[PDB]
Ligand binder design. Sequence first.
Ligand SMILES: Cc1cc2nc3c(=O)[nH]c(=O)nc-3n(C[C@H](O)[C@H](O)[C@H](O)COP(=O)(O)OP(=O)(O)OC[C@H]3O[C@@H](n4cnc5c(N)ncnc54)[C@H](O)[C@@H]3O)c2cc1C
Length: 456
Amino acid sequence: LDPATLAAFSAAFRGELIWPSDADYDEARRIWNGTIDRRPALIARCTSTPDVVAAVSFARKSGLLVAVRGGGHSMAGHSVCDGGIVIDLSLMNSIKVSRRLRRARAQGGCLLGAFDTATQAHMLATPAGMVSHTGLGGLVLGGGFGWLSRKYGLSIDNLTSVEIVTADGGVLTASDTENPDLFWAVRGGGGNFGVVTAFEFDLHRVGPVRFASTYYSLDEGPQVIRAWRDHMATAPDELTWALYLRLAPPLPELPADMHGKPVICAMSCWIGDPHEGERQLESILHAGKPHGLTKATLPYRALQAYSFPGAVVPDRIYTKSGYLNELSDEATDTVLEHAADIASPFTQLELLYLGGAVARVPDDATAYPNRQSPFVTNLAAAWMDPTEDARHTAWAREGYRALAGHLSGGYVNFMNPGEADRTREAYGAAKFERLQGVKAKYDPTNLFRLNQNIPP
Ligand SMILES: Cc1cc2nc3c(=O)[nH]c(=O)nc-3n(C[C@H](O)[C@H](O)[C@H](O)COP(=O)(O)OP(=O)(O)OC[C@H]3O[C@@H](n4cnc5c(N)ncnc54)[C@H](O)[C@@H]3O)c2cc1C
């Protein structure tokens, strides 16, 4: 490490440096995917945009492999690197909300729960992921979907501008009117094009939400999933209905003879009038007998903080996901045969219906692929014992291969560390090559390669 560069970076960087000798280094480098044990040479905790600029320039000059960390939830483990530098944005957590203009400006290191807390102070909101502590950074740059998406689209579908630090250390504002090629690419292209230090979103009024969660016996699985698939094909935007095949959590609402056994966990909500929501959710809650039924009228920030029942954070995860255009009866059976073999109490086989507002955005308006594929299956193995990695990974892998005949594309934010190759297939040829032209203009060095990578 050349000293003049380091020393001038020390004079510009008004944040915290964590070195491999420091006590807090083992914790600071930990990311949510515990199977990713990497030793960065240097962890930089930025507090403002000039901090990131200094961190970007110093990494460019010094030749260090760049990681960027928002909330650290990368299923591929991109946010920590072996022997490089970590531009850590976790301290840049602030949000300014205009209730009157319905505008939220959030720093690149925000967590979802912080963002939704600030907007819900004015009963405002904009779509994002379902787990409170995942980061706004990586989620939004990949698309971002959740409870508000069928009504209001992806997270990017409400983005209006970004402040971004490009590989050359320059700071650019990208929007629909300013650097619009870059705005297209960051809306689905990940961290490939620079470090976003500020997002601006349009917001929506979201009052109380009538919500429901329940569990169905697996030997009623066929009629439940079929009812689910059949209903969502024509369901109104306001109804979001998700299925999570999993081992029943040992919760008092469920009978003890169901604890630990595979079930279907159905979570449903109605974005709109709670009285219309109660009528709507009752029309979908009885495809089979609902066990452990919880129905509530929750403020939207409570809905955001609910997932997942049991409130356990796993240490180790491996995920295989893809989209479906159709969910045949044979595919439904296949899902059920593999869900019955679930081993860890923290593993889920997620089945989501997007569509709605997501699919009414034209294919080419952003960089997010597969808007016209409604279904998402996410085989999400999650466990604690690091000596058991092979048996839980094998469940995701072998379940994915049995469904390969229905699966196409892939959400970049659900990719596991060994899926660097799925990139061209996930984006498609037209989107991949346009992304490469933005990557050629803004990061021709591929300084930012710790992501679902798009080489220039
Ligand atoms: C428990 C859990 C639940 C999830 N639920 C959902 C969900 O409901 N819906 C959904 O759509 N996705 C979901 N995700 C996935 C989430 O969208 C991605 O994992 C996302 O990448 C997480 O971002 P992060 O910032 O926390 O991750 P990190 O690991 O920090 O980073 C992810 C990627 O984005 C880059 N990045 C992060 N911040 C920035 C920034 N400011 N500028 C540039 N690049 C940046 C990193 O370089 C990295 O390549 C979930 C993930 C987890 C772990």
